[PDB]
Amino acid sequence: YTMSLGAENSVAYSNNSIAIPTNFTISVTTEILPVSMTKTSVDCTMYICGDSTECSNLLLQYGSFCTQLNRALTGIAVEQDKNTQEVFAQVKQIYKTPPIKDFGGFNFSQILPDPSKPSKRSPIEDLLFNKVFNGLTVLPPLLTDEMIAQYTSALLAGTITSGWTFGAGPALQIPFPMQMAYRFNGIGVTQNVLYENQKLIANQFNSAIGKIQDSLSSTPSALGKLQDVVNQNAQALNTLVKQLSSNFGAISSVLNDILSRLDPPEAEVQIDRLITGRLQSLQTYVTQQLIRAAEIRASANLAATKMSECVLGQSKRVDFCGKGYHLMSFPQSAPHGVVFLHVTYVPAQEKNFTTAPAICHDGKAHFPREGVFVSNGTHWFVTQRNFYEPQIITTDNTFVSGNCDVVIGIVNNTVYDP
Amino acid sequence: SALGKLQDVVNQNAQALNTLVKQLSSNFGAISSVLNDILSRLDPPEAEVQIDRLITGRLQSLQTYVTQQLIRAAEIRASANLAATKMSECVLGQSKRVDFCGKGYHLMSFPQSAPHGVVFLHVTYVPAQEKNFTTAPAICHDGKAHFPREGVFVSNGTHWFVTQRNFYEPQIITTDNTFVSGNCDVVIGIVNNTVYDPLQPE
Amino acid sequence: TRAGCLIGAEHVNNSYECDIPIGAGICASYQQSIIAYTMSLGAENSVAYSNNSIAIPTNFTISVTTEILPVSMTKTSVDCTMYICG
Amino acid sequence: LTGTGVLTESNKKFLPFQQFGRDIADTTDAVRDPQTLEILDITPCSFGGV
Numbered sequence: 209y210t211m212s213l214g215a216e217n218s219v220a221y222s223n224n225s226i227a228i229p230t231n232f233t234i235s236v237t238t239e240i241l242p243v244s245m246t247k248t249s250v251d252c253t254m255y256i257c258g259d260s261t262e263c264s265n266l267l268l269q270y271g272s273f274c275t276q277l278n279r280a281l282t283g284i285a286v287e288q289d290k291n292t293q294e295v296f297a298q299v300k301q302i303y304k305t306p307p308i309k310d311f312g313g314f315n316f317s318q319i320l321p322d323p324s325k326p327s328k329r330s331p332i333e334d335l336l337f338n339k340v341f342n343g344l345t346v347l348p349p350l351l352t353d354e355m356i357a358q359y360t361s362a363l364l365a366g367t368i369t370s371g372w373t374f375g376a377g378p379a380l381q382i383p384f385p386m387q388m389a390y391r392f393n394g395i396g397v398t399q400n401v402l403y404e405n406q407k408l409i410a411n412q413f414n415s416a417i418g419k420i421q422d423s424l425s426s427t428p429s430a431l432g433k434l435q436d437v438v439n440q441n442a443q444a445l446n447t448l449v450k451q452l453s454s455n456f457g458a459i460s461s462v463l464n465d466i467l468s469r470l471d472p473p474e475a476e477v478q479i480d481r482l483i484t485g486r487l488q489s490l491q492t493y494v495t496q497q498l499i500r501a502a503e504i505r506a507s508a509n510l511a512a513t514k515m516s517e518c519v520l521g522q523s524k525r526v527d528f529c530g531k532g533y534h535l536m537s538f539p540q541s542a543p544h545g546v547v548f549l550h551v552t553y554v555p556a557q558e559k560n561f562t563t564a565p566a567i568c569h570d571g572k573a574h575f576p577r578e579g580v581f582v583s584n585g586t587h588w589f590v591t592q593r594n595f596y597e598p599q600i601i602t603t604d605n606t607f608v609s610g611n612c613d614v615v616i617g618i619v620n621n622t623v624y625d626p
Numbered sequence: 627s628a629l630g631k632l633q634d635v636v637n638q639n640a641q642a643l644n645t646l647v648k649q650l651s652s653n654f655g656a657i658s659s660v661l662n663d664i665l666s667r668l669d670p671p672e673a674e675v676q677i678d679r680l681i682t683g684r685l686q687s688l689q690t691y692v693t694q695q696l697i698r699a700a701e702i703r704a705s706a707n708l709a710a711t712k713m714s715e716c717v718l719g720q721s722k723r724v725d726f727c728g729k730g731y732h733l734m735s736f737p738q739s740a741p742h743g744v745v746f747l748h749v750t751y752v753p754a755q756e757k758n759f760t761t762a763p764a765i766c767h768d769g770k771a772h773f774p775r776e777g778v779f780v781s782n783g784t785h786w787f788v789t790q791r792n793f794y795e796p797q798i799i800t801t802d803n804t805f806v807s808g809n810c811d812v813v814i815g816i817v818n819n820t821v822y823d824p825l826q827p828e
Numbered sequence: 829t830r831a832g833c834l835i836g837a838e839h840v841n842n843s844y845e846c847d848i849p850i851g852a853g854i855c856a857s858y859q860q861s862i863i864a865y866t867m868s869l870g871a872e873n874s875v876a877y878s879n880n881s882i883a884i885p886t887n888f889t890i891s892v893t894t895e896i897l898p899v900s901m902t903k904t905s906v907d908c909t910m911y912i913c914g
Numbered sequence: 915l916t917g918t919g920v921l922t923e924s925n926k927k928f929l930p931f932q933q934f935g936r937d938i939a940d941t942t943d944a945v946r947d948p949q950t951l952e953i954l955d956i957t958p959c960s961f962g963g964v
């Protein structure tokens with residue numbers, strides 16, 4: 209079939225019609241990013257020549273190719289620890305949550321460490337981790353999964369107990385509901401909306417978090433982005449190893465068989481063929497790892513940016529910290545990567561109102577100081593743009609600039625003076 | 627070590643060139659690494675074989691060098707793009723991106739020229755000497771719920787004030803720095819206080 | 829250690845900031861002799877959180893930090909024919 | 915069949931006709947001793963970077 213690009217949706221546009229959300233939902237979305245790559249290390253001489261002295265001596269005729277290859281892989285291995293550090297080690301102190309988790313109805317039990325498990329991982333982190341001979345060795349990460357989990361929990365503790373202040377200076381404690389109120393202001397929604405609907409908001413939040421764990425559990429492909437990295441590197445190593453079975457024109461792919469059959473004057477020729485082929489195979493591997501490493505580095509840099517802007521603060525960048533109006537984010541540790549739970553404010557249940565650019569009163573043009581002028585069909589009100597809350601139009605929520613003969617579409621109404 | 631980031635680039639390129647040059651001393655299976663020695667000893671029918679070995683090895687060495695320079699160039703390009711972004715957002719403006727223009731609240735930045743690079747001096751505002759206050763989401767007065775227009779309601783233990791969130795500056799709570807929304811029976815943790823009306827005296 | 833067998837470094841219980849990375853949470857430093865330890869991730873800091881307590885800065889400082897970025901690379905040029913054949 | 919490594923008793927159930935085995939790398943990792951018909955596993959001698 210010819211693919212659909214999405215459902216068609218006409219907007220009820222007119223020169224005096226505005227839609228304003230009378231409700232909203234709290235949505236939590238998951239963003240999964242690769243941070244690090246398996247720190248592989250290949251011993252060039254052993255890969256090519258094994259323990260053969262005769263081959264090793266011939267390998268030296270090629271100069272320092274093996275030094276370059278060993279060096280390139282070492283450089284990658286170092287980068288991988290740098291990548292992890294840049295993303296997770298963004299907090300100087302290891303912050304702890306209080307013994308009593310009273311956050312005004314907000315339940316963080318699925319993102320905070322579960323004390324009953326030796327791994328000290330959150331219920332979600334636990335789920336994320338559950339989902340994902342020839343001179344070839346693998347080096348361990350500098351930071352163990354436990355240490356990465358500790359960094360994550362510190363970031364969570366800071367985010368929950370001191371908002372974003374710990375990401376700028378010292379951690380300044382603040383009631384969670386009050387923190388959320390500030391985050392509402394940050395998206396153009398007045399703080400009273402948070403408090404008046406605090407119970408609803410906490411419930412929508414708690415529900416959304418529960419959905420995250422269920423979504424990940426029931427969606428095996430959810431962490432494909434991390435699994436793809438693992439698969440690509442495993443595939444690269446398997447290919448590199450398989451190349452040792454190739455003859456490359458030699459009488460045998462086995463160096464020991466050549467040496468047991470032939471004298472040096474003839475063995476050299478057969479060995480040279482294996483060296484050329486195996487050296488070429490190793491160069492191919494390293495080149496691909498350098499290119500792949502660059503991609504991982506870019507991802508790690510993106511993850512580090514999100515850690516700073518989505519977790520250690522509130523972003524005003526659209527689609528940077530989830531789809532919707534960013535409120536806050538919570539990091540979760542994952543296998544060779546990081547998972548961000550983005551908490552966004554999403555407008556809901558909008559309705560049509562008649563609007564005007566200004567109100568005409570006593571010959572003066574009055575403009576809304578913060579909101580927009582709307583009519584329910586009989587009366588004009590001024591309300592905040594992101595949430596329907598129809599206030600009486602007064603001199604304390606409007607300002608005057610010019611007369612009524614300038615503004616196009618200006619309407620006649622009363623402006624109340626307290 | 628402060629400029630290690632710039633020195634590392636210099637070292638990597640110098641190292642790459644040194645390696646490329648050293649490869650000219652390799653035989654690659656030839657009787658000699660020196661092309662002139664091969665030509666002075668052998669006739670074309672035999673020299674060709676020895677030369678071909680040097681060409682293969684040297685061509686391979688040069689291809690290795692160039693590939694590494696292309697990959698390395700990509701890293702430098704990315705860094706330059708980041709530097710250009712910071713020049714625009716940290717120097718030619720004030721950033722609201724956390725940790726983008728230094729650690730703290732970005733005020734401004736000043737660029738400085740450096741060897742094959744740029745150095746940014748990030749001037750940030752860093753909060754200091756905080757103290758504990760008792761706070762409330764709203765003040766209850768005359769049955770109405772009053773919320774702070776800009777700051778936060780805080781108590782020093784006996785009196786309630788409204789102050790800007792990033793710097794302690796305890797103002798009297800008045801109708802000119804709060805707004806009303808709903809009654810006192812909705813907000814959780816609302817506290818009783820007086821909200822001063824500047825018009826009441828007149 | 830999980831990184832292999834480390835010989836010559838004295839293992840201690842005290843955790844410090846990482847100096848020379850060994851791997852798997854282990855770092856080494858010169859303190860004199862070379863020692864091995866599990867790296868610290870930073871000092872622990874509990875926040876005095878409660879449902880009605882806020883901290884507000886009564887002062888501030890002006891901090892200047894330095895960020896150093898590479899912009900350009902040496903513009904090398906290699907004559908392929910001359911390099912190979914002189 | 916020559917090489918260097920550590921010979922240990924194998925728990926691999928070779929069929930009556932199989933003389934040696936290979937791993938996923940397609941390299942010998944087990945042999946049948948030509949005199950005793952004992953199956954031996956072959957592992958490389960301890961190695962690693964320093």
Ligand SMILES: *[C@@H]1O[C@H](CO)[C@@H](O[C@@H]2O[C@H](CO)[C@@H](O)[C@H](O)[C@H]2NC(C)=O)[C@H](O)[C@H]1NC(C)=O
Pocket residue numbers: 309315316317318
């Ligand atoms: C926070 O939410 C968790 C669930 O995610 C609550 O734990 C559940 O508590 C009920 C009892 O009310 C048990 O039947 C469930 O088996 C528990 N589930 C899990 C995963 O532990 C937890 O009690 C909530 N905390 C608060 C303060 O409400």
Ligand SMILES: *[C@@H]1O[C@H](CO)[C@@H](O[C@@H]2O[C@H](CO)[C@@H](O)[C@H](O)[C@H]2NC(C)=O)[C@H](O)[C@H]1NC(C)=O
Pocket residue numbers: 230231232233408411412557
């Ligand atoms: C705004 O939407 C929320 C749901 O997102 C409404 O809350 C639900 O109300 C129904 C009853 O109609 C209950 O059965 C649900 O359990 C409630 N959900 C939650 C999370 O509490 C809310 O009433 C709506 N508000 C307005 C003004 O429409």
Ligand SMILES: *[C@@H]1O[C@H](CO)[C@@H](O)[C@H](O)[C@H]1NC(C)=O
Pocket residue numbers: 220227558559560
């Ligand atoms: C506004 O009116 C149009 C009809 O002109 C209707 O299609 C649209 O759904 C209405 N919008 C809302 C939010 O009710």
Ligand SMILES: *[C@@H]1O[C@H](CO)[C@@H](O)[C@H](O)[C@H]1NC(C)=O
Pocket residue numbers: 584585586587
């Ligand atoms: C508009 O709002 C006012 C005040 O609540 C109400 O009295 C009036 O009936 C409303 N008009 C319509 C058409 O709903």
Ligand SMILES: *[C@@H]1O[C@H](CO)[C@@H](O)[C@H](O)[C@H]1NC(C)=O
Pocket residue numbers: 223224616617618
């Ligand atoms: C909208 O267009 C109509 C003409 O169809 C015009 O009469 C009306 O004044 C316009 N209103 C505004 C706000 O432009």
Ligand SMILES: *[C@@H]1O[C@H](CO)[C@@H](O)[C@H](O)[C@H]1NC(C)=O
Pocket residue numbers: 568618619620
């Ligand atoms: C508004 O009222 C004035 C009279 O004060 C009148 O002249 C003007 O035409 C009216 N404008 C509209 C859009 O009704």
Ligand SMILES: *[C@@H]1O[C@H](CO)[C@@H](O)[C@H](O)[C@H]1NC(C)=O
Pocket residue numbers: 756757758876883
């Ligand atoms: C607030 O009080 C706690 C004790 O409950 C204390 O540890 C903390 O340092 C105080 N904060 C400030 C800024 O004085």
Ligand SMILES: *[C@@H]1O[C@H](CO)[C@@H](O)[C@H](O)[C@H]1NC(C)=O
Pocket residue numbers: 782783784785
């Ligand atoms: C709170 O501030 C007021 C006004 O400066 C002062 O009179 C009062 O003594 C202060 N209370 C405490 C506990 O410091």
Ligand SMILES: *[C@@H]1O[C@H](CO)[C@@H](O)[C@H](O)[C@H]1NC(C)=O
Pocket residue numbers: 814815816879880
């Ligand atoms: C804080 O919790 C206590 C119970 O320990 C409760 O009495 C008090 O009203 C709560 N205050 C707020 C602002 O939630």
Ligand SMILES: *[C@@H]1O[C@H](CO)[C@@H](O)[C@H](O)[C@H]1NC(C)=O
Pocket residue numbers: 766816817818
């Ligand atoms: C605030 O004062 C009212 C009386 O006007 C009283 O009914 C209410 O319980 C008081 N609330 C608090 C938290 O003191």
Ligand SMILES: *[C@@H]1O[C@H](CO)[C@@H](O)[C@H](O)[C@H]1NC(C)=O
Pocket residue numbers: 839840841842
């Ligand atoms: C570290 O502490 C353990 C006890 O938990 C002790 O047995 C061990 O000897 C100590 N090691 C050193 C050298 O500090």
Ligand SMILES: *[C@@H]1O[C@H](CO)[C@@H](O)[C@H](O)[C@H]1NC(C)=O
Pocket residue numbers: 948949950951
């Ligand atoms: C000779 O080899 C056979 C295996 O083919 C074995 O069964 C037999 O016992 C061996 N005899 C001696 C003396 O080793």
